[PDB]
Amino acid sequence: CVTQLLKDTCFEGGDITTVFTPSAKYCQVVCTYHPRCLLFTFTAESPSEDPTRWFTCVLKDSVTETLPRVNRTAAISGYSFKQCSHQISACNKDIYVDLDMKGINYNSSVAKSAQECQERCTDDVHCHFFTYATRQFPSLEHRNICLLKHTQTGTPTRITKLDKVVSGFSLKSCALSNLACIRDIFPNTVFADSNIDSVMAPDAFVCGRICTHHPGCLFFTFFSQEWPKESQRNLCLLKTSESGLPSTRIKKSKALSGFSLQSCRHSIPVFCHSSFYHDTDFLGEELDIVAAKSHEACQKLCTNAVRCQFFTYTPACNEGKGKCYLKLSSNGSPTKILHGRGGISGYTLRLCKMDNECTTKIKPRIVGGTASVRGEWPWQVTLHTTSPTQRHLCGGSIIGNQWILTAAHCFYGVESPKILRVYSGILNQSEIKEDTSFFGVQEIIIHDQYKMAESGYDIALLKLETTVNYTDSQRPICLPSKGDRNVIYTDCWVTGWGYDKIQNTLQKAKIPLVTNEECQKRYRGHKITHKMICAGYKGDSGGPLSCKHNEVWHLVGITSWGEGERPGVYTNVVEYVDWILEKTQ
Amino acid sequence: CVTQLLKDTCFEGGDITTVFTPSAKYCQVVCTYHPRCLLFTFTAESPSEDPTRWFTCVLKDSVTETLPRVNRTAAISGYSFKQCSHQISACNKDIYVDLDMKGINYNSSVAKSAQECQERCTDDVHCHFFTYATRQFPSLEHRNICLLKHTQTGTPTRITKLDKVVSGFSLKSCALSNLACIRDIFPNTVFADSNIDSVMAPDAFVCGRICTHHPGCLFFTFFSQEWPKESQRNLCLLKTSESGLPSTRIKKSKALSGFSLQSCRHSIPVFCHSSFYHDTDFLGEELDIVAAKSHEACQKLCTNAVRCQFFTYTPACNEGKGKCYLKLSSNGSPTKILHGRGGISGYTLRLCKMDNECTTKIKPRIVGGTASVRGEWPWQVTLHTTSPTQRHLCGGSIIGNQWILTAAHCFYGVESPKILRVYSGILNQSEIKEDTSFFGVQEIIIHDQYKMAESGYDIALLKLETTVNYTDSQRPICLPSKGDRNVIYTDCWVTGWGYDKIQNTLQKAKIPLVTNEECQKRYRGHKITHKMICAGYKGDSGGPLSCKHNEVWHLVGITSWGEGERPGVYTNVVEYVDWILEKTQ
Ligand SMILES: *[C@@H]1O[C@H](CO)[C@@H](O[C@@H]2O[C@H](CO)[C@@H](O)[C@H](O)[C@H]2NC(C)=O)[C@H](O)[C@H]1NC(C)=O
Ligand SMILES: *[C@@H]1O[C@H](CO)[C@@H](O[C@@H]2O[C@H](CO)[C@@H](O)[C@H](O)[C@H]2NC(C)=O)[C@H](O)[C@H]1NC(C)=O
Ligand SMILES: *[C@@H]1O[C@H](CO)[C@@H](O)[C@H](O)[C@H]1NC(C)=O
Ligand SMILES: *[C@@H]1O[C@H](CO)[C@@H](O)[C@H](O)[C@H]1NC(C)=O
Ligand SMILES: *[C@@H]1O[C@H](CO)[C@@H](O)[C@H](O)[C@H]1NC(C)=O
Ligand SMILES: *[C@@H]1O[C@H](CO)[C@@H](O)[C@H](O)[C@H]1NC(C)=O
Ligand SMILES: [Cl-]
Ligand SMILES: [Cl-]
Ligand SMILES: [Cl-]
Ligand SMILES: [Cl-]
Ligand SMILES: [Cl-]
Ligand SMILES: [Cl-]
Ligand SMILES: [Cl-]
Ligand SMILES: [Cl-]
Ligand SMILES: [Cl-]
Ligand SMILES: [Cl-]
């Protein structure tokens, strides 16, 4: 695919819509995330253009996947990232100097700095972007004012130059938000607040997933297939309120209500709808119709056709040669959902690259007894120490392509990264031979405030020398979201090889969380804190406390000190999220 | 359906496009003929509106088939006639006083009157509308100037008030044009002149039918299914030239070229595409999907769904329960035509009401021997005379719901219309009994210049007292088009009951045309003229010489005088087209 931009170039004619962006680089993000845009043309600040046309971001589509390039000064053009195998971010950390980004201003308070005003926007339910008047701003009245804004689109309605002011976006999509995510989904309930948009959805999960990526949507009501009024079946009503919460909880059958999870975006599927919808036909515009052997292959044909957004495989009785209908609409959704016409429908997987790789589905395997097997806990690594002899030293978790999360105390009297060897995808320690391949560590980042395990801060990152080619054997686990701080995890597991004594086959064990004060009562001498967590009723130093919640695995804890019944104490990973992100980029 | 307009009413929001029309009444025609418009809002001349918004005709669509009505002064709103069972005209005879209708001006010559300037526009290959500067127009230079115009749309690009000028449309769609229609369709031939538009068509007939109703299209090239370049299969290229003719005849296989038949519109199918296209899938936007027993019923489900423009029935092996896909696009055509996916496709018949009823298909029957049978020649009437006794007097042809075309000489010593009785749908004269129903004549319009049969002008209209409910038994025949003057008819027939001696069963006879000078040589004493035609090698006074050409029956002649081999002489109906239309409206 083509990621790089085009200096002084305009794509002639394929317009869908026009928005305002601070830069072409973010124009490209808008295009990538909009359901039809394939190419675009940003207009930079320039003498050769009037100020009203600056910051214009024209989203475009073409049947051929491209358009005519004509020369224009200060026109930056580009392609979307839909066509790409590399992952997709959505997080713009830029503070734009002298840029006044207009929207509906709704709070206007004082702030120490642009950084604090960004933290405020990010932590707010409504904020899309901010403008911060610096201390050098002439009007004393307006000096240090942090005004938060929102628009229909997430995009500013205008962009103008205004010296001594800095604008910037919300970092909710950088996993930096302290906002609580309400995952509670309310059956037989409707909400009646502001209806800002509507889509047709096959079910409420998809309805909620759509709410999450829609910038104006804070919560929703889905009117199900079995809903009485036919005109409203499969209707996903995207809603907002001035409070941020829904005004009232009206009971009603066959309807289903919930919240945006914008703040937990990085740990949830959002753009990745992988299910198939049986005896279901998605109505849209027809891209193509091809012979296909199964619904699964139909989805592939869609995924690999860039303009395709959803499909309906009509199965062949007769012979094995169904018809695969590749479809699209203006909004990524079907215009109508029919049941009872025998179709098998779903969506493009071309989207799942927009999702965090740690949210991809778990491969069904016969997790038998309490002995693990290949692929089962593929985030687990075994940390080897070359010195004295090559031996297992610690457990660790893949959380990145180049990053291991583990315990700081594992590195007591480790004088360089160069004695360390990280093995992935390992069942048996016995499997490890001299010829075996491993990742070498390049850097050990220990928390600068770490002293002792039983004190706080027992957390470490290994930056690997080479990156991991992800596989069923080797995959990352998600960090818990700062918004998920009150989630009650009830499916928690520890894994590792016993570390003293050690075992060969990777062991596994479902174990229960225990509350920080039920833990404190059973341990005195040093204080258990908010930055720790407990469980018990095993594994190694550095190993994961992995909790499964809503089909996704979370790295809730790192094994710190067992002391043993007295429960294991773990580093509370959630409390080190800023830190992990700060250090990893 | 709703035909009547709405005073001071605007339909809020469903905009497709915006054009300029002289009046709301013609706005309604534009809407009816545009492939998506269902409702609209015209803006009349008014103090309460600025002059730039006058004559605005906003074409609108709605998923529900209507929109919100809000009050506005000088906004006229209405619905299309798509929803209607009554026939549809397209012919606006209005001369708009003080109205300057802007377009590309291309000829600018002098003219005696507005009527003559309209006749000139009508007779011209390129003309959509005209403006005529009256003799009272101040600038002496511009006084009496008849300027012809065209636009992309057939619609003027602007409308402005300009005192002492009159504007008006072409009457090509009133069957008033003297322009020759080139029906010759050129196999393995392309044209290379100006490409003004393109559509996907299943075959070249449809391609040509689309050219005919497209105002900018004078001729076309169709690139067939078997065309080498896949990107251009089923491509219907709508073309024009400054000459009006195609520049050159480039040979090339699998391509097929032809002309607009705009001038012969009233005798040809144009909007009525009644065929089914097998192993053919029409791509468009999906309106609905329903269970259906056959392709024929699928077409019905489309026809009766007003937004549906075309369809694809996928047949059930298995059971009798296919899937009928109701579809639509922006232009009435499929966006792509796929072969080989097993679909049966075609178009809405909701269109055929736009076609002249005399173009509807002939019902297959076993036309046996030379004795007719029920339904065979359903335009034929038997003219009875009540006096002395009730007896067959003349043959006649239904050409309207309330009109019979026949011979002037039939009415020798007929003192009132009240002795006349018109019977339709009659095989046997014996079938006629006292209880039998008939149409009473209200008026006998004889050509004022008629003297004697063997002189000219032997033509008469019967205006009936009640109108004919059309049926397989009773249907009209088309007048020949003034543009079809050089058509060589080779499938001509006379029908009637022998009128002297007479027969009971309706007789039929294929007979050959004979040239006017091959006729003149075999008849002297009075002159055969351009306004007569001959045939021979039978029927009554007043009866039809019916010629079948391109699947359509034409009333080429009325039986005037046999004199018998010496051939029959007929009134040459083509030469009395202005007259028939003048008298019938
Ligand atoms: C605007 O936003 C700010 C911060 O999100 C709100 O300020 C807080 O108001 C509450 C209520 O007194 C206090 O407890 C907080 O200490 C305030 N914070 C700060 C930084 O002053 C403020 O109330 C909002 N006001 C409106 C309605 O615009
Ligand atoms: C404009 O249109 C008129 C009529 O359609 C053309 O006038 C005719 O020109 C030919 C060529 O000399 C004459 O034989 C006709 O007698 C003319 N008719 C009249 C009414 O004058 C005229 O040539 C066209 N001219 C252009 C190119 O604008
Ligand atoms: C556009 O710019 C390039 C780079 O200078 C030039 O070579 C080209 O001729 C320009 N215009 C075209 C191809 O129309
Ligand atoms: C490695 O694990 C497999 C799977 O259980 C086991 O059969 C085998 O015994 C182990 N290796 C050794 C040293 O036996
Ligand atoms: C629109 O006009 C009608 C006719 O006077 C009036 O009764 C009506 O109240 C007006 N407006 C509405 C219903 O919004
Ligand atoms: C009427 O026509 C039918 C059809 O040929 C014929 O059988 C019958 O003989 C006719 N009527 C009379 C008077 O026989
Ligand atoms: Cl400001
Ligand atoms: Cl559901
Ligand atoms: Cl398309
Ligand atoms: Cl494709
Ligand atoms: Cl989506
Ligand atoms: Cl003029
Ligand atoms: Cl063909
Ligand atoms: Cl639609
Ligand atoms: Cl419908
Ligand atoms: Cl059409």
Numbering used by the authors:
A (entry chain A), B (entry chain A): 2 to 317, 321 to 503, 508 to 545, 554 to 580, 585 to 605
Quote the study's own text.
The regulation of extracellular proteolysis is critical to blood hemostasis and innate immunity and proteases plasma prekallikrein (PK), and coagulation factors XII (FXII) and XI (FXI) act as master regulators of several cascades including coagulation, fibrinolysis, complement activation, and inflammation 1, 2, 3, 4.
A major conformational difference is also observed in the apple 3 domain with residues from the loop connecting the apple 3 to the apple 4 domain becoming exposed in PKa as opposed to being buried in the center of the apple domain disc in the zymogen form of FXI. Consistent with this the FXI zymogen structure shows Arg184 is buried and forms a salt bridge with Asp488 from the catalytic domain (LL1), rendering it unavailable for binding to the FIX Gla domain 19, 21. A comparison between the FXI and PKa latch loop1 structure reveals the PKa β‐hairpin Glu478‐Lys481 ion pair is conserved as Asp476‐Arg479 in FXI. Latch loop2 maintains a similar extended β‐hairpin structure in both PKa and FXI but whereas in FXI the interaction is with the apple 3 domain in PKa this equivalent β‐hairpin has moved by 40 Å to form interactions with the topside α‐helix of the PKa apple 1 domain.
